[PDB]
Design a protein around this nucleic acid. Structure first.
Lengths: 185, 167, 222, 51, 148, 53
RNA sequence: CCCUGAAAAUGGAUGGCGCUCAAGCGUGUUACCUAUACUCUACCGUCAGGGUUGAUAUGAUGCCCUGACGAGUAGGCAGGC
RNA sequence: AAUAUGUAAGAAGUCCUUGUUACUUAAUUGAACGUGGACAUUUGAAUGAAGAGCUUUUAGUGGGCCAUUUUUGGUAAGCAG
RNA sequence: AAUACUGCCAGCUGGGACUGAGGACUGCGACGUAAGUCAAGGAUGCUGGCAUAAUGGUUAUAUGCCGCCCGUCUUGAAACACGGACCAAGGAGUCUAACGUCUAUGCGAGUGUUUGGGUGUAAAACCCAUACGCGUAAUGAAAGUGAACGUAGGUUGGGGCCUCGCAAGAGGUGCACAAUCGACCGAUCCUGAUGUCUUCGGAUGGAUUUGAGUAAGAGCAUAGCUGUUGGGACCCGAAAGAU
């Protein structure tokens, strides 16, 4: 008999070789497995994980975010990388003439990039152009924006957004929410 | 169909084996077996019989002869585990045994189709027995009751505890 | 790129000079052990000649074995056996000696047998039941190549360098011990010399400070 | 594939240690000590034999 | 569906994932939102605080027509202009040629100031605006002319 | 202890002499020779049981 | 240590037979018996770390290496008939 | 007293110099947070770390019992606690 | 002196059992300058008999040892606690409306054809306008007002990238994310300017206050496990009540 200290046959709890039957994704992950295996490239490891990732942790990234990243100092003629979708922010009126690498681009984003003078590149072209992350810049969209996460954590005195359907007066604005009716949470 | 196929098939060529390092040394006998020594066969047709020892062969066996004019045991090769050795010993030197070997002890195996439903010896081998055992009896008849010893057979009796016996 | 003769030959040359370094080191260690023990004997005789008494030093090192199984173990003894890496019956580990460590062993007295070992049984252990922690895997030692690949940091190149650090406890004992997987010993072939273990060694039992008969116990258990 | 143990198997023993060879050569597992019959003290031995 | 459902991994196992000690009965703690003041009090004051009671002044006969007032910010105003003429106005940033924008035909009632238009004049038609938005527009040199 | 450790590090910046700053427990003790002069060993043994009431 | 104290109901239990310088009581020395325990090896499966795109014919969820681990009601998940 | 029990064993730290302030001081005095510089392999006791941390969602359960030691009620209980 | 006892031998040798995994070469080594050989990263060599019900498998029996009747509620069941004489077939977490979490798919600040229209090999598939739902702005009881001082801020930490270096490291940029101090919008409580139909307006600056907010948008739709609620609601079961 063994006195176990940890638990036995626990998975790591990490996601490998994702659940979809997307054959192009399977090609891409074949490629980046090859690279992360044989390139000693932390960039390749990170993009491998990001390709493993699910949908809620593949949030959509904006051309405005891309512009902020390039608007960093000495970081403008870099290659932008986004393991996800690239959305069009009509809330800006300018864009540089860089290149961008990503799985998916929307119509507006494609038009924005090529109108600025850029090229929307796939990650295999990125790999064969730059197998070690030469002059790259990976970005990630905000995870903690969603309706799900504003409800996650609910309870007394946390300020954490109850899980209701309808809104207005006579919908959770009463006993427990104010002091003349009951108390303050 | 009834059963489709697999996606995949195995290899039909056998891979070679590794290079086994089990090299051959010769046999190392026990101290109690030197030539010219008397023995007792325990197994086989002549189980329980006292016989002379002459020559370890090269295929790990022992060459013996009765002698044949004494008891009825011809030349043969036997096994050192299937014999016992004795303290009793005679001289042998002044005979030739270098003639005999495995190729002399060929069997000439049968054709497998030949079936023994219901139902010989070699002039060469019998005359070899003649010359060897006449020399051997000339060497034996000096010392007393060794002929009686080989002529008689060996058994166990109520009291014969082997771990206390001394052969 | 042929890579057949020059490279293999240079590896053999590097191997040879490493063999020579290991051999001279082992010579130094033999001299050290023999010198030390014979000086201890000689100094004992000197004090006995003078009429004085030679208080010998204590032992910096012990060997501990878990005897008791995994069932019915209170939480402090259980945690302490887990800290000393004793998670099964008949399992042993080296331990450095301190106030702290010895009080710890006094906590886990009913569950272990510990004692002061010798070079002979240490060498026997590390040659027959001696393993290494390479990427959280138990690997056989089996080669000073492996051992120096893991412990070139700490002045080690060989299994005997490891044993040397062990018995002459060094500034790398911690790393050497946490490299040595705990020893997975069998039951004592000679039995335990007693009918009933679970009483202190004093009272006709087995556990506790078996301070110098631990060598006999370990050899019977290995 | 398999663990061959020292304390038999002199080949793997030498593979792990050349001092095995030179140790066996100079016969140090049975090494003699120069006998020197020094004496103990009367005070020590009478303290010992003090019934 | 039916074959990916755990009812198939309960066939043989006695209590269907509900238990031996405390069985699956009909309605052990009530039916519906029963007992919100008595024995589900902790749930009501933990996850839905404000559920019990009434607050305000009532509104008899309410009309979302009356309460129609969609909103818009100024980035999305410059989005309201169609791109195909937007680039001409942008390069030809000047007065006496400035584009008019019908927020109402765009479907909006109010206009709000969420920041950083260019400094080009532009004309806007709206029923309602905010102070900061009107200030940002006339700081870009444009104007709002109101409508109903 | 902290400011004294800093003083020790200052002295080792002055001479480079291998501080070994960390505390260490009460290590097991080293050999020695006790003499016997004026200090002969008194043999002891137990005392019988007297009730002492 | 033994004896008296010591009396309950179907016939009746150091488990039974039986045991008397014991097969009882106290203590000591050894040898011996045996667990799904311990050690070594093989095999099944899981978990973890790794290797392998190069061409042909193979599936890169493939092929291979190393290490540890395997109790289970209510229950949860996973792969399958 | 024993046993149990809190905390410290440094990098988010120590020292030197001076920046801020509507706070504080009789006071460039002090407080809090900082600029700049110095202090490494023993970066501040031992041992171990099987990865460390973090969220979401949901089952079952909410009749318990026995032993050592402490202990209440009861003469006591395979009693109740 | 020697023996006993305790310990040491990388001293020699004998006897016995179990196992032979793996499958071209690679590595560690040993004997010798070499030739090669070896017990060195897992057994080979030589021989006999059978060549078949001989070995083995199944099945019945015999023998040694063990083995209480299943299912259930139970602290505890083989129970002197319940159901079950036996066999066949039927027979119990389903579907629906709205939803939470997670995952997959498409599009993306948008998303949703399928109320309806046109059409058609016809309850299929294809195409479409207008709206409309959800989301893109919240807060307040409401009147109502309505989210950049700053590179959308400052500090600390942070994967990845860039520079120097062979490497250790050193510096710069630092997404997500975590803690914090700020600023903006709504609510509350204060100050109360240019001014004024002198009773209106509310500029500016604030506060251990408050919000399901802003702080370079992320959501919509379909499907699936799971869970919740209402429905016969996993199947069977009242004493009753009403027409």
């Amino acid at each position: 008999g063994i006195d176990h200290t940890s638990k036995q046959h626990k998975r790591s709890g990490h996601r490998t070789a994702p659940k979809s039957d997307n054959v192009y994704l399977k090609l891409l992950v074949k490629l980046y497995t090859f690279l992360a295996r044989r390139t000693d490239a932390p960039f390749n490891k990170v993009v491998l994980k990001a390709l493993f990732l699910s949908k809620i942790n593949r949030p959509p990234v904006s051309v405005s975010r891309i512009a902020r990243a390039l608007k960093q100092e000495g970081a403008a003629n870099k290659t932008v990388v986004v393991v996800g979708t690239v959305t069009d922010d009509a809330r800006i009126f300018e864009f540089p003439k860089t290149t961008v690498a990503a799985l998916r681009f929307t119509a507006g984003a494609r038009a924005k990039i090529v109108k600025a003078g850029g090229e929307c590149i796939t990650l295999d072209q990125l790999a064969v152009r730059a197998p070690k992350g030469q002059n790259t810049l990976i970005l990630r969209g905000p995870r903690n924006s969603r309706e799900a996460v504003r409800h996650f954590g609910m309870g007394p005195h946390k300020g954490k957004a109850p899980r209701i359907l309808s809104t207005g007066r006579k919908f959770e604005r009463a006993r427990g929410r104010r002091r003349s009716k009951g108390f303050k949470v | 169909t009834a059963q489709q196929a697999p996606k995949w098939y195995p290899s039909e060529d056998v891979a070679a084996p590794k290079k086994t390092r089990k090299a051959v040394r010769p046999q190392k006998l026990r101290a109690s077996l030197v030539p010219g020594t008397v023995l007792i066969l325990l197994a086989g047709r002549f189980r329980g019989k006292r016989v002379v020892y002459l020559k370890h062969l090269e295929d790990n066996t022992l060459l013996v002869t009765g002698p044949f004019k004494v008891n009825g045991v011809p030349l043969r090769r036997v096994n050192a585990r299937y014999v016992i050795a004795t303290s009793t010993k005679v001289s042998v030197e002044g005979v030739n045994v270098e003639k005999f070997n495995v190729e002399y002890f060929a069997k000439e195996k049968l054709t497998k189709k030949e079936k023994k439903e219901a139902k010989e010896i070699k002039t060469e081998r019998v005359e070899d027995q003649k010359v060897v055992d006449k020399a051997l009896l000339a060497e034996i008849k000096k010392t007393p009751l060794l002929k009686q010893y080989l002529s008689a057979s060996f058994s166990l009796k109520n009291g014969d505890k082997p771990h206390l016996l001394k052969f | 790129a042929e890579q057949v003769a020059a490279e293999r030959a240079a590896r053999k040359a590097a191997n040879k000079e490493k063999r020579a370094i290991i051999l001279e080191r082992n010579a130094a260690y033999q001299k050290e052990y023999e010198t030390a023990e014979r000086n201890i004997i000689q100094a004992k005789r000197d004090a006995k000649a003078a009429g004085s008494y030679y208080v010998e030093a204590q032992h910096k090192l012990v060997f501990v074995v878990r005897i008791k199984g995994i069932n019915k173990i209170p939480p402090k003894p259980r945690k302490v056996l887990q800290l000393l890496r004793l998670t099964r019956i008949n399992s042993g580990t080296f331990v450095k000696v301190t106030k702290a460590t010895l009080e710890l062993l006094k906590l886990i007295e009913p569950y272990v047998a510990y004692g002061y070992p010798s070079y002979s049984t240490i060498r026997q252990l590390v040659y027959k039941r001696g393993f290494g922690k390479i990427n959280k895997q138990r690997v056989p030692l089996s080669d000073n190549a492996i051992i120096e690949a893991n412990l070139g940091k700490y002045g080690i190149l060989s299994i005997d360098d490891l044993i040397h650090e062990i018995i002459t406890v060094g500034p790398h004992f911690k790393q050497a011990n946490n490299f040595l997987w705990p020893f997975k010993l069998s039951n004592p072939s000679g039995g335990w010399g007693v009918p009933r273990k679970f009483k202190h060694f004093i009272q006709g039992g087995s556990f506790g400070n078996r301070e110098e008969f631990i060598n006999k116990l370990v050899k019977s258990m290995n | 594939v398999l663990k061959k143990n020292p304390l038999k198997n002199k080949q793997v023993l030498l593979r792990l240690n050349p001092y095995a060879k030179v140790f066996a050569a100079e016969k140090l597992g049975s090494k003699k000590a120069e006998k020197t019959g020094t004496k103990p003290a009367a005070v020590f031995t009478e303290t010992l034999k003090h019934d | 569906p039916s074959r990916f459902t755990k009812t198939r991994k309960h066939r043989g196992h006695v209590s269907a994932g509900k238990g031996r000690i405390g069985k699956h009965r009909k309605h052990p703690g009530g039916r519906g939102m029963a007992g919100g003041q008595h024995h589900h009090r902790i749930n009501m004051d933990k996850y839905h605080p404000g559920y019990f009671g009434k607050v305000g002044m009532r509104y008899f006969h309410k009309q979302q027509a009356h309460f129609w007032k969609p909103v818009l910010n100024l980035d999305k105003l410059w989005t309201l202009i169609p791109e195909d003429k937007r680039d001409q106005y942008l390069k030809s940033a000047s007065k006496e040629t400035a584009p008019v924008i019908d927020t109402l035909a765009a479907g909006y009632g109010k206009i709000l100031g969420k920041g950083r238009i260019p400094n080009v004049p532009v004309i806007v038609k709206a029923r309602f605006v905010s102070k900061l938005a009107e200030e940002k527009i006339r700081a870009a040199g444009g104007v709002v002319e109101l409508i109903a | 202890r902290v400011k004294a450790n800093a003083a020790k590090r200052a002295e080792a910046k002055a001479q480079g002499v291998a501080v070994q700053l960390k505390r260490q427990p009460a290590q097991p003790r080293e050999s020695r020779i006790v003499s016997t002069e004026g200090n002969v060993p008194q043999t002891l043994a137990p005392v019988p049981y007297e009730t002492f009431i």
